[PDB]
Amino acid sequence: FSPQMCEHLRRYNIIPVLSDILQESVKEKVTRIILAAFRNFLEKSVERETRQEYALAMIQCKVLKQLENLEQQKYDDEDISEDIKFLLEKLGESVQDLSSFDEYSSELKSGRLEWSPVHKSEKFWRENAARLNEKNYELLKILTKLLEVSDDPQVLAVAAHDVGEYVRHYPRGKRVIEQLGGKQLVMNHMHHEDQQVRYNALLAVQKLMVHN
Amino acid sequence: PETPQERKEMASGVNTRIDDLQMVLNQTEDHRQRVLQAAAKNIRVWFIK
Amino acid sequence: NFEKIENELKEINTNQEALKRNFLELTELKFILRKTQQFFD
C-alpha cells in the first residue's frame, strides 16, 4: 500500500516466486489475493520503475500467458473479474511500450542481446521494416558484426532470429546480407554444437532463400 | 544473359546456390527426422493424457 | 509443448515443397545453361 515500501520489497525475486504459486492455483483463494498483490504492487508505484516489475516480474515469466486463460474461467467474486481486466490492460501496453526499437536500439548498441518479448512479437517487426535502413544499413551491419566476432552461447540464437524476421518483411534485405557475407556466417553457425543456435540459424538460413 | 563469358558468371552463381540449397534441404530433412524421432515417441503416452 | 511441435511441423512442411520447388526450378535452369554453352561453342 505505501509507495516507498514497494521499492523496499523489490530487492528480491518476489514476483516470479509468487507466479510459481500462481500457476498451481488449487486453493482458489490464494489466486484471489496473489492477483490482488500484483495489482497493489503495480498500481501504487510513483516512478518509472514499474518496468522493473515487468522484466523481473510480468513479461518475462509464465504469468501473462496464464492471464489469458484466467480471463476465460468463470469466477464468481466480482473483484477478481476486474482484477484480471486491470492486469490485462496494464500488461497489454507493457509488451509494446519497449517493443519500440529504441530499447531494441538500447539492446543493440549497448550489446548483450537478451531474450525479450520484443523479439518474438511480430508487431515489433511489423513496425521496424525500414528502420535498419533509417540507420543507413549499419543497424543491420552492427548486428552481423556482433554475430561475427563473438561465440555467444545464448544471444547468438537471438541474433540469428533478428536477421530472420527482418528478411521476411523486406525482400531487398536478402541482397543486403549477401553484400556483408552474413549468410556464410549463418551457414557456419547452424553447424554449431549447441541445439538452440542450430535451430534458430536453420530457420534463419531458410528465410533467406524462400524465393531466390 | 544473352552474351558470352557472362554465362560463366551465371552458371557458377547457380552452382554455388545449388550447393547451398541442397545443403539446407539435407539439413531440414534430418531436422524433421530428429523432431519426428522425438515427437512420435510417447504419443501413446500423450494420447492417453 | 504441443504448440512447439505443431508450429515445427506446420512451418517445415510448408517450407519443404516450397523449397523443393526453388531447387527443382534451379537444377533445370542449370542444365539448359550447360547445354546452350556447349551448343553455342
Curated annotation (Swiss-Prot), chain A:
Expressed in brain (at protein level). It is found in: Cytoplasmic vesicle, Clathrin-coated vesicle membrane. Subunit of the V1 complex of vacuolar(H+)-ATPase (V-ATPase), a multisubunit enzyme composed of a peripheral complex (V1) that hydrolyzes ATP and a membrane integral complex (V0) that translocates protons. V-ATPase is responsible for acidifying and maintaining the pH of intracellular compartments and in some cell types, is targeted to the plasma membrane, where it is responsible for acidifying the extracellular environment. Subunit H is essential for V-ATPase activity, but not for the assembly of the complex. V-ATPase is a heteromultimeric enzyme made up of two complexes: the ATP-hydrolytic V1 complex and the proton translocation V0 complex. The V1 complex consists of three catalytic AB heterodimers that form a heterohexamer, three peripheral stalks each consisting of EG heterodimers, one central rotor including subunits D and F, and the regulatory subunits C and H. The proton translocation complex V0 consists of the proton transport subunit a, a ring of proteolipid subunits c9c'', rotary subunit d, subunits e and f, and the accessory subunits ATP6AP1/Ac45 and ATP6AP2/PRR. Interacts with AP2M1. Belongs to the V-ATPase H subunit family. This is V-type proton ATPase subunit H.
